[PDB]
């Protein structure tokens, strides 16, 4: 049975809302993938989550109560104000925007325009489609927001359409990183 | 069930495994990797180098909490009457970082979710041949169900005659699983 | 500079039943936990109490100190000292880094005259 | 209780000196400090567990070993007069902002 594998996990969480006006500090103790003990600032003390944590609850609350409660300030609030403010909360990566047509262009035939919006940060963004300067609401859909893993995201936004003479389709993108909205045009030849 | 907020900071996630005394120490902010501490070099490795110039973290804090991981993994193992971890089969998804353009430098991303336990091999194959360069990967990220996910990156040049596979080797898989991808 | 603790000069002499105050100000780059230790003759320092955040008060055997982040102080207080209180008091701190490296001050010698 | 060995020791310049520390508190952390007038206590070396050795604030001229949980030694390869001091060993439970339990000290004088 040498192939038996064992592991523990310690997962701390500082939940911030409206700056640091509201903070919820949660600490999870895990064996293999079973959370057996947890500290939650809203609760105010350590609580056994499963039978496995029964032996710890009392000891943890008697020994680490004050120190753990204080981390809401000494770790959470401190890290937010002193380290996140100047980095994470300051990161602004402008999205790259390009348009592609799904099928070969056939005048007056159904098709799909795909607006690829990539490499942006933070995750909050808004993409709109326009046909001859008028916003399209029907036939618009999008893929799931993708977290690239390198502090950038991407998303594909599609527009079911029918290319007609002289039409100009515009992919419109609003994001905190842009002083003004990015607009890319696709013209029906 | 999930707790909601504007931002989430995980300052000091500890993962300690046995046998092999395997550990990982990371900082996460809103789901992204701030850094991981290389326990052998005793060095904090930042995902975004520009960040390390405005903030820092003494790797010793990683060593300390990792040591406590080793301690707790033993007290808990014994306390559980040696209940071992139950393997899961991971799932891979392959996609490009930016739109693929012939001859345009790009990056292939292999996202692997449902990883458990956090021990795995993620490599790439080009034309069925393993790639040994331009490959990099994140640390293990935590999931709500306490399983993990990880991403591997492969720099490449889009070409009509190139085939790619993200190979994933894990104990929960009989044979390595290949997630194919073609431009 | 590296974290440091600054406490009253060297030696102070009090009479029994006098009130005791030993100053301690700290210079730290993070958000440290603060402590006071007492070292009686022929022994090593022994823990008195700690305080993790601003406004928190630690206490033990009549001694107490309040975390004052505004003045970066952790001044020791004792209502009425006794001859047996004669010893060396140390101010110390640990950082929120998880380091567990405890930094001590220069120590203050207290002579409570019989 | 934490016990140090030896309690007293006179050495000559260039001598190889080793101070021993033992604790039955089952503490994961162990530390070596020196105490000197004007400096208070200064951390030399500490350990997070058996096999680990971390440099303190003033490691120069020193070396340490943590061969087991209970024991932690400090070694002065080539004793110099500046190393004359009172060395203190302490153990702790490695719980953030942990309290230290000190030994009664070892008075070392280098002549």
């Amino acid at each position: 049975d040498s192939e038996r594998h064992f592991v523990v996990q310690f997962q701390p969480f500082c939940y911030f809302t409206n700056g640091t006006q509201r903070i919820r500090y949660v600490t999870r103790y895990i064996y293999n993938r079973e959370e057996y003990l947890r500290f939650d600032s809203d609760v105010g003390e350590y609580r056994a989550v499963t039978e496995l944590g029964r032996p710890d609850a009392e000891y943890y609350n008697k020994q680490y109560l004050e120190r753990t409660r204080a981390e809401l300030d000494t770790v959470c609030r401190y890290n937010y104000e002193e380290t996140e403010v100047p980095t994470s909360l300051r990161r602004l990566e402008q999205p790259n925007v390009v348009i592609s047509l799904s099928r070969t262009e056939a005048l007056n035939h159904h098709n799909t325009l795909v607006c690829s919006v990539t490499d942006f940060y933070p995750a909050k963004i808004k993409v709109r489609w326009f046909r001859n300067g008028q916003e399209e609401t029907v036939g618009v859909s999008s893929t799931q927001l993708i977290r690239n893993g390198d502090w950038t995201f991407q998303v594909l936004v599609m527009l079911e359409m029918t290319p007609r003479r002289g039409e100009v389709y515009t992919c419109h993108v609003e994001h905190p990183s842009l002083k003004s909205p990015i607009t890319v045009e696709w013209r029906a030849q | 069930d999930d707790i909601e907020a504007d931002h989430v900071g995980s300052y000091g996630i500890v993962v300690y495994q046995s046998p092999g005394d395997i550990g990982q120490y990371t900082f996460e902010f809103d789901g992204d990797e701030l850094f991981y501490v290389d326990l052998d070099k005793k060095e904090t490795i930042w995902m975004l180098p520009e960040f390390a110039q405005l903030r820092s973290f003494d790797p010793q804090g990683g060593l300390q909490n990792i040591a406590t991981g080793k301690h707790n993994l033993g007290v808990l193992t014994k306390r559980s009457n040696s209940t071992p971890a139950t393997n899961e089969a991971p799932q891979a998804t392959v996609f490009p970082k930016s739109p693929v353009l012939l001859g345009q430098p790009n990056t292939l991303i292999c996202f692997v979710d449902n990883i458990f336990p956090p021990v795995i091999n993620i490599t790439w194959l080009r034309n069925s041949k393993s790639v040994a360069d331009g490959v990099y990967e994140t640390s293990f990220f935590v999931n709500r169900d306490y399983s993990f996910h990880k991403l591997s990156y492969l720099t490449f040049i889009p070409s009509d005659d190139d085939i790619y596979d993200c190979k994933v080797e894990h104990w929960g898989l009989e044979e390595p699983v290949l997630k194919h991808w073609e431009p | 500079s590296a974290d440091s603790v600054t406490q009253t000069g060297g030696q102070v002499a009090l009479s029994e039943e006098d009130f005791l105050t030993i100053h301690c100000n700290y210079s730290a780059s993070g958000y440290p936990a603060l402590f006071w230790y007492v070292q009686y003759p022929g022994e090593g320092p022994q823990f008195l109490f700690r305080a993790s955040r601003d406004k928190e008060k630690g206490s033990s055997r009549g001694f107490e100190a309040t975390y004052n982040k505004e003045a970066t102080s952790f001044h020791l207080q004792k209502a009425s000292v006794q001859e047996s209180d004669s010893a060396v008091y140390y101010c110390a701190l640990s950082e929120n880094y998880g380091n567990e490296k405890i930094t001590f001050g220069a120590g203050t010698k207290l002579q409570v005259v019989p | 209780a934490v016990t140090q060995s030896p309690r007293n020791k006179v050495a000559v310049t260039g001598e190889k000196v080793t101070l021993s520390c033992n604790q039955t508190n089952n503490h994961n952390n162990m530390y070596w400090y020196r105490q000197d007038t004007g400096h208070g206590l200064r951390l030399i070396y500490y350990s997070y567990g058996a096999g680990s050795t971390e440099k303190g604030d003033i490691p120069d001229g020193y070396k340490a070993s943590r061969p087991s949980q209970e024991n932690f030694s400090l070694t002065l390869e080539s004793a110099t007069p500046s190393q004359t001091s009172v060395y203190f060993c302490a153990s702790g439970d490695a719980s953030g902002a942990e309290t230290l339990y000190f030994g009664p000290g070892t008075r070392l004088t280098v002549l």
């Binding site: - | 300052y11 900082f27 909490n65 301690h71 808990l76 | 998880g98 | 719980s95």
Partner: peptide, 11 residues
């Protein structure tokens, strides 16, 4: 310099 949540030891 950043602070870190302390993994507390059991037993």
């Amino acid at each position: 310099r950043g602070g870190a949540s302390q993994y507390r030891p059991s037993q």
